[PDB]
Amino acid sequence: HISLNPDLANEDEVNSCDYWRHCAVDGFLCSCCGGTTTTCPPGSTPSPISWIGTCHNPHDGKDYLISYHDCCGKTACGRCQCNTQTRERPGYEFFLHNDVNWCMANENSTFHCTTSVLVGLA
Amino acid sequence: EVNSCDYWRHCAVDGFLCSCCGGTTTTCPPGSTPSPISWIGTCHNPHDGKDYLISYHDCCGKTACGRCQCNTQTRERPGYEFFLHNDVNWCMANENSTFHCTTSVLVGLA
């Protein structure tokens, strides 16, 4: 199931803002920043909180719940900036909102990169 | 013309021209502090044909202006001739050493 397993995919595909699971990413993809889709770059810390949403996987035709955790405590990665907004909503629907720093509750709130963690079927 | 890197007084500027940053050649932008120390350049005046001493004081205590970056090196020398050298922050001894912009102050004839 390559479409669910980014580490088995072509890096060029995964590092693209058009990759199916990056549908509400506002920030730099961690997989372009020395990490992977599910691992923070060295010396950056996962956020315990995140925005969330669902993304459609056109490869298997199913819909998945994504958690858009950040990596924190290093200055901006600067690589692979995305600003995708599928099903994103304003701050009165706060956990669907991606114009806030989801590092906000970390020990160090400096934003490094963001990613898309697959939680399960929607 | 004064906002161009080719203006004659800017012949040893490495930095942002303060005249593009809300100041003038001899006044810091509001809220930035002059350096008491500087490098010095010797620049040729194309009008009168004479060489003049220019003191490149910085303005300090605000983050980088980012406008009108210049990197001119006429008569500039390395750090073993320290007061002729422009690859150091001449804000280094200010209360706040953050570099904002560079001024071009006419001292007088060489």
Add this chain to the structure above:
Amino acid sequence: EVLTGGHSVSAPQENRIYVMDSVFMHLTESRVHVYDYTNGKFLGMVPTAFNGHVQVSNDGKKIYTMTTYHERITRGKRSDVVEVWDADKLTFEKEISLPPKRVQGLNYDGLFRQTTDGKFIVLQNASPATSIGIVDVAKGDYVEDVTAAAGCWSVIPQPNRPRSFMTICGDGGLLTINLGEDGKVASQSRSKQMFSVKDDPIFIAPALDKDKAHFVSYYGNVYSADFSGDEVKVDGPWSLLNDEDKAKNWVPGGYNLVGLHRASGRMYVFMHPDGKEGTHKFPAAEIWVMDTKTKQRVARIPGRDALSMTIDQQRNLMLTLDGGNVNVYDISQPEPKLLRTIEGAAEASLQVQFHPVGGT
């Protein structure tokens, strides 16, 4: 010659605009750039550390910033603050300590506002639990934390009252807070539901009149909140769109995406065709000019890929901003007239503001 400091901004206050540059690629070095809108001249700047927010005091005398520091930037103790700066000297005057939960996010106007009378700064917190923080400017103190606003977002001041504001809540209604002269909550009220959160979400940016506010939705509808009385009366939707517009799927998009010219009732909205899920922050293909009394469009002009705007009432001006460039429009007549573009005003800005000239 002698290099001097201590100088004031070289252009009159009435010429000044403030471009909040997030510098997202280097977000620890955000800053406010001050420009003269009449000629594009760069006048100065205020440093704002990590993800600064900015506003100018209503009386025009001070600039307020909100930011976060850490002792060693990426490690060490956090300090969230408001800073007061002199508007003419662009110098730091005082730091006001905040609890370590000020909102970190993009520069919507409604995250960092003030009461009409200018005595209190009103700011959004997120820990991620939301609340509204009140700062007493004169005292230099954080004086109130409005937990009534949990699950709500953003601050819309009421221009017809000295210390009142509204916030948009998770029920699709509005919470109004009236502060006392001490900055503590003096009273509050909750409107009926204005919009369906699930079916017709609104953009948070208000088109703010003296006694009412309009909001546009993801689907191009308009909702209104009338606060001419103590109780807010809500209505809507009316559609921005006629049948031809619908056929090309026109919808709003942007950040600070609307404005109101109070003397005429004209509302300005960034719009783009081919709207669908996920296009709500797209750059403007057009600016539409709506008559809010007749509920009909009166003009449309090219959008110049703008994302955010602001209006000056008394000079009849609109600024638009595409992230880097600021466009200056004359809106004294129904069709806006482009006067100039200020190129390279910022690297990554979603907010521009005029210096206030109307006083308190």
Add this chain to the structure above:
Amino acid sequence: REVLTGGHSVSAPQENRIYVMDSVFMHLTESRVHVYDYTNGKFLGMVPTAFNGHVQVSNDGKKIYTMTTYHERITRGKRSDVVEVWDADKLTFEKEISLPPKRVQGLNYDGLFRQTTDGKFIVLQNASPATSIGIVDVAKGDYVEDVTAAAGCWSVIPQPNRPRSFMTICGDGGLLTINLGEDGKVASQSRSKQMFSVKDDPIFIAPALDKDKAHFVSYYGNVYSADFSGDEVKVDGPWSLLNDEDKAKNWVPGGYNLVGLHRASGRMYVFMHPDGKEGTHKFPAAEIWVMDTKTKQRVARIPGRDALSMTIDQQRNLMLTLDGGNVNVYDISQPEPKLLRTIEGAAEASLQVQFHPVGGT
């Protein structure tokens, strides 16, 4: 399904890593080190370095040392100049070493932030603007004391044939040698005869460093040398990089970290440009020239790719060059360098790249 985790090490082995010191001059308070794999151009991670950071890797390859300045409120408040020790494999902060508030703030010449050959001391340039050399005891995590003998001198050239000795270039045109004791204090010193005329033939500070000698190039394309094989430094020069044809076209050196030495062959690498005149000493390279320092002849010339800085790896026979944003990787195992690849967009404003050390005992 998935869980985001931290605590990970750099994905590529040490021998693949290089460090691009990005000043980010447009936003100099957010300077940083970018870590790349030179074999494939992959971005591996980064170390934040606040205002105008400097960087070096420990000689043993285990740690990254940075030097930077903080203030309590960035543009106001109390100044803290520091060295930081970071783990090289985890790219995590370990320790801060306090410095007096006069560490050099300036462009990233190698010689501003170095270490003794034995790796026990960090040796750094101070400017208040009075100059001195600062010594940091890495084991203790302490600043030792200023080398005040170095007043009026600039930059640090370690002597690779001794454990705790280095030289600095003085305003008299000679070299001052400092020999540290085991505590990091000055045990002895010496001053060479004048090597170069400061007025008439100023040298670039960047050395082409051998195990027991250093070569320097001048603004006018001459070469000077300092031999420290013996008790005291012996100086000589000039010899010219230039033949008649070169002179006729006014070829001269230019750049920042603009020279390098391949020690096993004695080849010296230098960035050069034509139409030299007053003010062109920091011009990008039109060409890289390769000189045999024994025969004093040029053995190759290749396009410069607008490079400004370089570094050499003795263990893999490589040269990196850097134009401010892009890193070029060359094989220098033969007299003519061969370009292997360019890493685009490695930095916004970098004048220094360095290899992760391999071996070198």
